[PDB]
DNA sequence: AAAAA
DNA sequence: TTTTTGA
DNA sequence: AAAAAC
């Protein structure tokens, strides 16, 4: 009766994924494509692989794929052969595809993004091995944090520890905002049970322009005092490295965690929840919508109609959905 | 690569 | 067909 | 002074 939306932001997506063999495949297809700069293949196959994870059954045949958007030809082609021997010879071809392995080994260093792992790899570099020792290379300071705790970020971040670097967050902030709301975003606040990563949003209802620009700087210069902040780069948010003593949590006796920080005006705090809660799929999708469907302007600071020529204010992701037209996702619902 | 224009 | 695809 | 980081 109901057909399935083609945008995230109007379905309902929960960590529950009954198509993991197919997504998986359509995940792999998408990086792939990535990697060779096709952005449009990559993009329709990270939507066919968004919409699988919104179903609450398995696709088990061909004709449990009818209705279902995001699934053109291709698409179904590579679906009908997961279905035919449980496997995708088309991800599976990926899979050993020397460009492919590369690619991912590479950017898994912290500081290494699709630029420089494609140099690496026409420069003939196959493991992190030879270009760590490499004597011509001359890398980034994002890079060598990457490479030295490389172990430790490429181990994901659980609950546990999520937690205590909320408390650390939390502790550091109210030190020199006491009136801060400090809330954690990304996919833990979506439910996740590991991430890559811990952000946070950060804001204050009686702090001034001044107030709200130092903050970052002070929150951060407190964590050097204190020998845990092994990386900062400050943009406004800040993408950091800190120094997580187990005694925290609830080997070395310590773990390197990423963590991103970003401070907003109190009064634009909904936009950059919405924002900063993610997934990145959903928020592509809230964007499009927004535009295509609605013809306003959405972003992690405002929303501006332009029909009307009015910017739209919103205490709380609620009113930012009412505002678009779409019956509230909530955050464990967004994990598209 | 799929959907809209 | 050509444009769009988040920003 | 492009790249990486959302
Ligand atoms: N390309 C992106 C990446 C991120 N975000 C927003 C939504 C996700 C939020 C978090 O960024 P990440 O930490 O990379 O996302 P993640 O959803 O938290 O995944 P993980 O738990 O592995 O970190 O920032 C976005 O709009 N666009
Ligand atoms: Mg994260
Ligand atoms: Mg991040
Ligand atoms: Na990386």
Redesign the pocket.
């Known amino acids: 009766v109901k057909k399935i939306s083609?945008y995230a932001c109007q379905r309902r997506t929960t960590l529950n994924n009954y198509n993991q063999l197919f997504t998986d495949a359509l995940d792999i297809?998408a990086e792939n494509?990535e990697l060779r700069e096709?952005?449009?293949?990559?993009?329709?196959?990270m939507?066919?692989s968004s919409v699988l994870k919104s179903l609450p059954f398995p696709i088990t045949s061909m004709k449990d794929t009818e209705g279902?958007?995001?699934?053109?030809?291709?698409?179904?082609?590579?679906i009908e052969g997961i279905i035919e021997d449980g496997e995708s010879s088309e991800a599976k071809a990926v899979l050993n595809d020397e460009r492919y392995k590369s690619f991912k080994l590479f950017?898994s260093?912290?500081?290494?993004?699709?630029?420089?792992?494609?140099?690496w790899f026409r420069m003939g570099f196959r493991t992190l091995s030879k270009i760590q020792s490499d004597k011509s290379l001359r890398f980034?300071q994002?890079?060598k944090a990457?490479f030295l705790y490389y172990e430790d970020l490429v181990s994901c971040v659980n609950r546990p520890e999520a937690e205590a670097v909320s408390m650390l967050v939390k502790e550091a902030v109210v030190t020199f905002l006491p009136d801060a709301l400090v809330t954690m975003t990304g996919g833990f606040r979506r439910g996740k049970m590991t991430g890559?990563?811990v952000?946070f949003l950060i804001t204050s209802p009686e702090a001034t322009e001044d107030e709200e620009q130092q903050l970052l700087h002070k929150v951060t210069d407190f964590w050097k005092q204190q020998g845990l902040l092994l990386y900062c780069?400050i943009?406004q948010?800040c993408?950091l490295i800190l120094k997580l003593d187990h005694g925290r949590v609830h080997g070395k006796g310590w773990k390197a965690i990423?963590v991103?920080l970003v401070m907003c005006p109190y009064d634009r705090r909904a936009f950059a929840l919405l924002?900063?809660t993610?997934s990145?799929?959903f928020?592509?999708?809230?964007?499009?919508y927004?535009?295509?469907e609605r013809k306003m302007?959405?972003?992690?600071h405002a929303l501006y109609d332009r029909t009307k020529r009015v910017f739209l204010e919103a205490e709380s992701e609620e009113e930012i959905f009412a505002h678009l037209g779409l019956d509230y996702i909530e955050p464990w619902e967004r994990n598209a």
């Not at 096709?38 to 196959?45: K, V």
């Not at 302007?297 to 992690?300: R, S």
């Open positions: 083609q297809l494509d096709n952005e449009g293949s990559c993009l329709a196959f939507r066919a279902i958007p995001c699934l053109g030809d291709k698409v179904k082609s590579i950017t260093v912290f500081g290494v993004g699709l630029k420089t792992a494609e140099k980034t994002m890079q990457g890559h990563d952000d780069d943009l948010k993408f990423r991103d924002g900063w993610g990145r799929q928020e592509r999708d809230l964007r499009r927004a535009t295509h302007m959405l972003d992690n």
